[PDB]
Amino acid sequence: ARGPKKHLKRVAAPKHWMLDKLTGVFAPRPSTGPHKLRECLPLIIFLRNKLKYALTGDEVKKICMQRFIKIDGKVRADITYPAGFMDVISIDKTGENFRLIYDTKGRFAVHRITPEEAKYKLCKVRKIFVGTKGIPHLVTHDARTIRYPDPLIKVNDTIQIDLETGKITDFIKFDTGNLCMVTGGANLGRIGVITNRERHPGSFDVVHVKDANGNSFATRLSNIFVIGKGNKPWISLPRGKGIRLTIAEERDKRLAAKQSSG
Amino acid sequence: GRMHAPGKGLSQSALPYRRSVPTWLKLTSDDVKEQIYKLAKKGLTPSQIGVILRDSHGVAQVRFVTGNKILRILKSKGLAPDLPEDLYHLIKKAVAVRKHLERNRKDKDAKFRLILIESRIHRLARYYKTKRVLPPNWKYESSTASALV
Amino acid sequence: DIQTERAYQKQPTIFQNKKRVKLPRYYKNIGLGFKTPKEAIEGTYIDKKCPFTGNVSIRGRILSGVVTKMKMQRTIVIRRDYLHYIRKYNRFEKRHKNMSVHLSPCFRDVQIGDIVTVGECRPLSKTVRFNVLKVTKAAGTKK
Amino acid sequence: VRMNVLADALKSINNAEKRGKRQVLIRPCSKVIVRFLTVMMKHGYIGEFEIIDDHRAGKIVVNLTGRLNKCGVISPRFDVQLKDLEKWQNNLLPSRQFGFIVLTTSAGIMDHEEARRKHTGGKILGFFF
Amino acid sequence: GKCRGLRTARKLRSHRRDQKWHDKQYKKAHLGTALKANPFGGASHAKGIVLEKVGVEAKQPNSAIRKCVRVQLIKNGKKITAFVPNDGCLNFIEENDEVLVAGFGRKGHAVGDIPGVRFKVVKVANVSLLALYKGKKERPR
RNA sequence: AAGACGGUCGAACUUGACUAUCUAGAGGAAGUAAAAGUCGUAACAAGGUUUCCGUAGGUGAACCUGCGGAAGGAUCAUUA
RNA sequence: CCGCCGGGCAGCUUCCGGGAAACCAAAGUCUUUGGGUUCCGGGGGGAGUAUGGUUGCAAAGCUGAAACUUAAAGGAAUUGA
RNA sequence: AGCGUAUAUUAAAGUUGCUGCAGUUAAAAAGCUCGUAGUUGGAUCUUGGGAGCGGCCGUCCCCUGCUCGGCGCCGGCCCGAAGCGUUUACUUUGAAAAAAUUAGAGUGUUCAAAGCAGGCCGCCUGGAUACCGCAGCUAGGAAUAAUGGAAUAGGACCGCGG
RNA sequence: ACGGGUGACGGGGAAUCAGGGUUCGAUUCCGGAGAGGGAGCCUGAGAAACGGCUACCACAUCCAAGGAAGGCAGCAGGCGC
């Protein structure tokens, strides 16, 4: 390497894209954007592989160059634009709106939302900051810089922003007894209520989360997103509601629905 | 088996079960302590004090008559000699062998037995260094080992 | 006593020419529950590389060896012992790795054999990357 | 010199059993020996035993039955993980039906059956079958 | 195993590491000299030019002559006695013919009653000896 | 702009020095394999002087002899 | 003179047990294999040779290969001559 | 629709032996003791108690203290949170761990090697899961094995001069 | 340790396997290094780049003899081995 790399081989592509082997050598290396390369869903992948609207990368090119698809209330004419967590994908001509939040397993589900819910999103604040005139500053998980915020919002809270104005409406404080979706590690997509936070000065602080059915699991603080106050999520969830039942239970449910079909 | 010999000798003391002092003994803790003080100040090792007591006065063991060991009595009173009374005896022997060997030059046996005694001095000296009975600077050197009596 | 080197030795943060009509001292608690020791606050020595009265931040690892050598200038060699586990023979082997570590004149008397706790800092010299943060006097050592 | 005390205790039981004695004398007794022999007894390979108590290391007189084949030590005391009990008791024990590996866990000194039961590793001391 | 301490790993390992040299096959592989001395230089076969034919007298109780041929390797220039196997196969091999030469079977050890012959001829000027023997190919004129 | 002084990084060239490998080798000297050559007979039966060991001298050749060992000896033993 | 205890040089005896056996209360307690530790062996030759190092005045000592050759060399015991 | 040969290498090889080899005579124990690293080191310090439930038996819970709220009760008792608590190995748990391969669940690529597809008269569905030594991180346990505390009392605690 | 050797780029992995293990891993994925051998630099956010430039060493093409131009361990293909 003598500079930045531009090709991403299909075997090196993040596993949650569920890309087949015998299609090609390469996968779409996501163009730089708000979310990380590893943890996004490129617009070509979501449009062609998941929705099956297009068949080839040229067909996706033909769609995205007619200004149809709108990511977070702005038109994105880049077929490998990184669409990541909490992002709101509205297609106007079809009349359909998707919020990219995780399946109960470590992948992105294709969760349809209503016109009135596809008008805002939840942003995890990353670092608070003072500018060049004692003007306070936020930085969120999706690279948004919000200045003149509410003077109580701190480094691990969640803010609800509007996708026209880009201004803070209401916020959920990071407390014990607040709903959190886990957005990294083994427990990727698990929804549960924060039970404890265990402080380790110099190391990564681990946070205990309780599922609805009394399933207790820990995650590092970085891989947690407060998505609701109490047991009330301020968004709509996929079918499953983030439980991640065992493989024996998933089998039982599968062949239950199978034998019921007959 | 012995440290520096092929022998496997089984000959030592056999203490009885009952640690209780017998009825006939009228010597109390302070009376034997006065006796031990007198014997040590006369010029006598913890070993020789112990045998004098059990032979003549009839003191089975001082650890039962008193609550202390003879050296802990003497080092509490401040009558304990500095370098211990087994390290002392090993140096004393080693000087006695070397003084013989300086004259009788062709004594190859005395040369071999001197090496064995000195290996035993070093090996016990370093035990006392770790247990802080000696300074870390303490040296056994045959040049000025006779300065130690 | 101090200012032996040709350049003037001062804590460069504190200003010592305030017109009037004792010298002040800059220090810091270096986090992770380490007591900024008494000699740091009440000494008159100068050190760039003291974690208390200098410009080094402690971050990363916190390791501990035994003091081996104290024959170089404001630096010591600690000896770190561990058991490496060979897999074929279900047994260990005794290894060691001795590192040059920066000792502040803050810790006034450390004896070779003392137990040290060291915090990772930026590279201080060619081989020095750690700083002595607390000393625990070796078994007994009262007299 | 006497570096392993459990090793000599179990060898002296083994020779006494082979020779066809009704009871045996173990010289330097210890918690680990008494805790080994209680595990043996609890399954019923030895009868009762009486630890003779001088003001030193004690002595044990063990009532032997004729239903013990072998009782052996494993020195050194290896760190048997729970996932390694199988591959230890595969090559140490005669069958999957009888025989026991006593190993010193955090709970106490107990056989592979109870170590599996309580979900615990530890260190192998010996075996009896 | 003799020493059984729980940290005697470098002892047991270093002991075994030293004592593997006393194995005849291990040393013959891991020292250079066997490969450095091997005419083939650690290869399956080798091509070489026939420079004369030779009648090697067989060993004891066996009483015969062996239809060997003296061959010079192309890549080394080392000289080799190669045994021409089957009955009257020496009549297809004339001099200045390049031959393909294999080992006999026993990995640089003299096979049968043929004294000091490691190698055997398999091809004669790009034609198999099996082919020229069984009458499948004729010699390239 | 060409050009020049100096510094610097520095390929490479010049004469020596050492050393890793290849290779010719008068000639010397061994070990080995070789169907019946010569000179003996050192060893295995007390092998015709019991054999072997360490060291030293000697000799066509196996070997011989001195000093001190060993039984793997040809004596588990020899009598008041 | 008669016995007992502990260390030592040995002896006799037996289905302790082992071992290929001769035999060994140790050369036993070993597929029912794990008390502690040092040295050291890997078919027979080539060869304790060559070479390098080191020690010695010399003789020589300690460390110590390879190419190449070879299907056996050898151990205990049996029956013959 | 393949089989023979040559060579490197694995199992056979318990002929490299950690599991697991041998050392009187088959190959092998330094001539003999001394000795620093290395390796290994005797016994000994918490046993014993409260109460539950099934048929004397079996398992379930109960064993160190010193500032901010309500289950509340009346400055208190309780429960909680931010701190504290000789070190170390050991063991179990959690986190963090690229895919591909390997193991492995689903699925008639006509079977199979593979592949990640597919299935039902627009709809319904997958794309799981385990494994990843050692070192580092985290939380329980305290048998086993190291290590520390008072012995010139410069000992712990409690109070008074300061 | 220092030095020397590697038919040594490292790892994910591969072959063989009772349980241990032994051998392989140039080879499509990740990381590194190189563009005939060394060295020096321009431009640019990023190069000590070679399908960039400047020297010397080795080789080598075209010459109106003054000069001009080189770099397959890219895809094909040729000689040598």
| Residue A222 burial (CB count, 10 A) | 14
D73, D129: one domain: yes
Structure tokens at A64: 């995205």
Q: By what method was this entry solved?
A: cryo-EM
Task: State whether the beta carbon of A134 lies below 7 angstroms from any atom of strand I.
Answer: no
Contact A70, A89 (CB under 8 A): yes
How close D45 comes to chain E (CA, Å)?
A: 29
Give first-to-last CA distance, chain A, whole Å: 57
Query: Between the CA of D89 and the C1' of H40, what is the distance in angstroms?
Result: 27
**Cβ-proximal residues to A96 (8 Å cutoff; 6+ apart), any chain:** A90, A112
Query: Was domain B81-149 assigned CATH 2.60.40.60?
Result: no
Would you tell me which residues 39-68 of chain D have a C-beta closer than 8 angstroms to some C-beta of chain B? 54-55
Close Cβ partners of B70 (under 8 Å, ≥ 6 residues apart): B36, B46, B49, B50, B62
Grouping H, G, I as helix, E, B as strand and the rest as coil, residue A222 is helix
Let me know whether D80 and D27 are in one domain. Answer: no
Query: Are D61 and D108 members of one domain?
Result: no
Cβ pair A201:C32 closer than 8 A: yes
CB within 8 Å: E4 and D75? yes
Chain B residue whose CA is closest to D1: B1
**What does the block give as tokens for A2?**
């003598």
Strands (E), D27-119: 46-52, 59-64, 71-73, 100-104, 109-111
CATH number of the domain at C1-142, out of 2.40.50.1000, 1.10.3720.10, 2.40.50.140, 1.10.150.120? 2.40.50.1000
Neighbour tally for B139: CB within 10 Å? 10
Q: Is E77 in CB contact (< 8 Å) with chain C?
A: no
**Chain F bases under 7 Å from protein CB?**
33-35
Domain count, chain D: 2
Counting as contact any 3 or more CB pairs under 8 A, the partners of A are C
Task: Kindly provide the b/e burial profile for residues E10-48, where b requires at least 16 CB atoms within 10 angstroms of the residue's own CB.
Answer: bebeeeeeeeeeeeeeeeeeeeeeeeeebbbeeeeebeb
Resolution in A: 3.5
Which has the closest alpha carbon to B49: B73, B25, B70, B72?
A: B70
Chains E and A touch (3+ CB pairs under 8 A): no
- The CA distance from C23 to C46, in Å, is 13
- Is D72 an interface residue toward E (CB < 8 Å)? no
Do D64 and D6 share a structural domain? yes
Residues D35 and D86 in one domain: no
- Determine the structural domain holding residue D93 and report its residue range: 69-129
Q: Is C128 exposed, middle or buried (0-12, 13-18, 19+ CB in 10 A)?
A: middle
Closest residue of E to C83, CA-based?
E7
Q: Are residues D74 and D127 in the same domain?
A: yes
Ordered by start, the domain boundaries in chain C are 1-142
Find the closest chain C residue to A204 by CA distance. C60
Question: Any idea what the CATH number is for the domain that residue D33 is in?
Answer: 3.30.1370.30
Q: Are residues D21 and D84 in the same domain?
A: no
- Helices D31-43 and D5-19 cross at an angle (nearest 10°) of 40
CB-based burial label for A3 (10 Å; 0-12, 13-18, 19+): exposed
Q: Is the CB of D2 under 7 A from strand H?
A: yes
Tell me whether C24 touches chain A (CB under 8 Å).
Answer: no
Nearest nt to E101, CA vs C1'? H6
Sole residue written with tokens 């983030």: A242
Searching chain C, which residue's CA lies closest to the CA of residue A203? C60
E35 touches strand I (CB under 7 A): yes
- Mutate which of D2, D55, D56 to test chain B, going by most B C-beta atoms within 10 A? D55
Nucleotides of strand I within 7 Å of the protein's CB atoms: 7, 18-22, 28-33, 45-50, 81
How far apart CA E50 and CA E98 sit, in angstroms, is: 6
Alpha helix segments (H runs only) across A100-153: none
**D53 and D82, same domain (yes or no):** no
Residues of chain C found within 8 Å of residue E9, distances taken between Cβ atoms: 84-86, 89, 91-93
CA distance A123 to A153: 12
Are both D84 and D63 inside the same structural domain?
no
CB E93 within 8 Å of CB E42: no
C-alpha A93 chain-centroid distance: 24
Breaks (C-N over 2.5 A) in chain C follow: 21
Q: Report CA(B108)–C1'(F73) in Å, whole number.
A: 38
**CB-based contact, B17 to chain D, within 8 Å:** yes
* Residues D35, D92 share a domain: no
Q: Are residues D33 and D75 in the same domain?
A: no
| Residue B33 CB partners (closer than 8 Å, separation 6+) | B66, B73
DSSP-derived secondary structure for E67-132: EEEEEEETTT--EEEEE--STT-TTS--TT-EEEEEE-SSSSS--TT-TT--EEEEEESSSBHHHH
